[PDB]
């Protein structure tokens, strides 16, 4: 079960290579749907409010959105499968780390907004913030560190 | 940089055959485009 | 002024049967009707203007 | 062992007289022998392995 | 009579578009020849000299003006032999000065403010065709600055 995120027209030449570099990465969408536009996918899609959302409001949307892991990237559409319905039929989907921290076998993996330190598409005027797939026992440490910092 | 991809259907009819196996991963700079394949690639099909 | 009009029936078929298929695969782009555009780039080479 | 060898005479011809000239001017690329690649992508495709 | 500055292969994608935008701009060269390697054109080929060393090296070299730009060769023509038998070859300003009809035009190294290639590993500095009555002024202004 693989959805489609269509790229709108007018892609520059470095930007077809920029989206060639997010091959296996976690992306949030509103509703599982066989066709979807990229403007509903980007970081702009939930800047609702008058301030772009900080790390708190990032967390709230991540439980109201349904996480998908990108498969192959065709130059016309981004093919993805979500992590709630598409994975009972197809067994196992590859995933790329953006973490500074390596993964072991058998860990469970949560996601954190990019608090540590971001593909921009100037042919389309949007940013693509991506979550940080770190292992879940660190998640109750690292967020508890950064709250303890302030 | 550019690793520009080639055309895969001229690949289907080879024009000539090599005579000896040659280690590719030994180096990079004699070559122009290279990709290691885990027996099947996205970009092929 | 009128009640009954004439409308054609069949849609248009733009199919890659023939040598346009080889250009789509090997050459990596495709002309709309190469079986005529490729033909009319020969008689112009010789005849007239 | 020997002083007198046999050597070929002619060079190698690759002239764009044919359907490659069409792709030269509109497609902007050129197969080496499209007269056979375009042929051999029809017997391979449907007949055998 | 046209020179053919050849480009060494291995060009990236925006670099052939980077030389696509300097159509009518002045380029120096060592010696008039039919074919010419591109490394003689580059700013590396003046060793890096300051503003003075270009003024010495411009007069020892021969000013040439780019015609069409093919990706395989940059076809230019010199300003000493190829123009005094034919008519006229165009020219683009890089100047902050808008030109008038009927002036004598010299060139100055760009003290005002540059097309840098990177996949070929060379810069290309270019002269500024401002009018020669300003050229005895502006150079004398800038010496009066220091």
**What is the DSSP track for B8-21?**
SSTTTS-S---SS-
Asked if A59 and A27 touch (Cβ cutoff 8 Å), the reply is no
Q: Nearest CA to A75 among A38, A30, A129, A125?
A: A38
Could you tell me which chains touch chain C, where touching means 3 or more CB pairs under 8 A? B, D
List, in order, residues 6 or more apart from E120 with CB less than 8 Å away. E7, E8, E10, E11, E15, E38
**DSSP symbol at D12:** -
Residues of D in Cβ contact (< 8 Å) with C33:
none
Asked if E131 and E104 touch (Cβ cutoff 8 Å), the reply is yes
CA distance C36 to chain D (A): 11
Asked if A86 and A2 touch (Cβ cutoff 8 Å), the reply is yes
CA distance A25 to A113: 13
Buried b (16+ CB within 10 A) or exposed e, E21-54: ebeebbbbbeeeeeebebebbbeebeeeeeeeeb
- A68 in helix, strand or coil? strand
Asked if A25 and A98 touch (Cβ cutoff 8 Å), the reply is yes
Tokens of A76: 């016309």
Query: Residue E118's closest chain B neighbor by CA?
Result: B1
Dihedral angle sign, alpha carbons of residues C12, C18, C24, C27: negative
CA distance E26 to E83: 14
**DSSP symbol at A89:** T
List, in order, residues 6 or more apart from B43 with CB less than 8 Å away. B5, B35
What are the residues facing A37 on neighbouring strands? A6
B15 touches chain D (CB under 8 A): yes
B9 touches chain C (CB under 8 A): yes
D26 touches chain C (CB under 8 A): yes
CA distance C22 to chain D (A): 6
Dihedral angle sign, alpha carbons of residues A96, A100, A106, A111: negative
Between the alpha carbon of residue E31 and those of residues E6, E15, E77, the distances in Å are 15, 26, 12
Residues of C in Cβ contact (< 8 Å) with B10:
26
Q: What are the φ and ψ backbone dihedral angles of C42, each rounded to 5 degrees?
A: -125, -45
Longest dimension (CA), chain E: 45
From its phi and psi, is residue A43 left (phi > 0), alpha (psi between -120 and 50) or beta?
A: alpha
Q: Nearest CA to A67 among A41, A94, A49?
A: A41
Tokens of D29: 């690329």
Tokens of A65: 């959105």
List, in order, residues 6 or more apart from B12 with CB less than 8 Å away. D40, D41, D44
**DSSP symbol at A38:** G
CA distance A133 to A108: 10
D37 touches chain C (CB under 8 A): yes
What are the residues facing A26 on neighbouring strands? A69
Interface-testing mutation among B10, B11, B14, B16, with chain D (most D C-beta atoms within 10 A)? B10
Contact B7 C22 (CB under 8 A): no
Residues of D in Cβ contact (< 8 Å) with C28:
29
CA distance E139 to E111: 9
Interface-testing mutation among C22, C25, C29, C30, with chain B (most B C-beta atoms within 10 A)? C25
Contact D23 C27 (CB under 8 A): yes
Q: Nearest CA to E55 among E108, E123, E112, E106?
A: E108
Q: How many CA atoms lie within 13 A of E6 on its CB side?
A: 8
Buried b (16+ CB within 10 A) or exposed e, C11-46: eeeeeeeebbbbbebbbeeebeebeeebeeeeeeee
Q: Nearest CA to E66 among E57, E81, E80, E77?
A: E77
Could you tell me which chains touch chain A, where touching means 3 or more CB pairs under 8 A? none
Cα A80 → chain centroid: 11
Asked if E25 and E62 touch (Cβ cutoff 8 Å), the reply is no
User: According to DSSP H, which parts of D1-49 are helical?
Assistant: 19-22, 34-46
Identify which of D22, D29, D38 has the shortest CB distance to residue C41.
Answer: D22
CA distance B26 to chain D (A): 30
List, in order, residues 6 or more apart from A84 with CB less than 8 Å away. A32, A66, A67
**DSSP symbol at C41:** H
Find where tokens 């024009």 sit. Answer: B15
Tokens of A40: 């509903």
């Amino acid at each position: 079960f693989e959805t489609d995120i269509a790229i709108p027209s007018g892609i520059s030449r470095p930007d077809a290579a920029a989206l060639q570099r997010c091959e296996g990465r976690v992306v949030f969408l509103p509703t599982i749907r066989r066709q979807l536009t990229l403007a509903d996918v980007a970081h702009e899609s939930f800047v609702s409010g008058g301030v772009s959302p900080d790390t708190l409001g990032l967390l709230l949307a991540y439980r109201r959105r349904f996480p998908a892991v990108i498969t192959r990237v065709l130059p016309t559409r981004i093919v993805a499968c979500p992590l709630d319905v598409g994975l009972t039929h197809a067994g196992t989907v590859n995933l790329r780390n953006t973490s500074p921290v390596d993964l072991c076998n058998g860990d469970p993996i949560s996601l954190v907004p990019p608090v540590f330190e971001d593909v921009r598409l100037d042919s389309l005027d949007l940013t693509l913030r991506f979550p940080v797939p770190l292992p879940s026992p660190l998640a109750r440490e690292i967020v508890a560190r950064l709250v303890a910092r302030g | 940089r550019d690793p520009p991809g080639y055309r895969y259907a001229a690949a289907m009819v080879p024009t000539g055959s090599l005579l000896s196996t040659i280690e590719v991963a030994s180096h990079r700079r004699l070559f122009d485009f290279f990709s290691r394949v885990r027996s099947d690639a996205n970009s092929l099909y | 002024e009128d009640t009954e009009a004439d409308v054609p029936v069949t849609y248009g078929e733009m199919v890659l049967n023939g040598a346009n298929l080889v250009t789509a695969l090997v050459m990596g782009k495709a002309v709309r009707s190469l079986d005529d555009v490729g033909r009319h780039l020969l008689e112009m080479q010789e005849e007239q203007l």
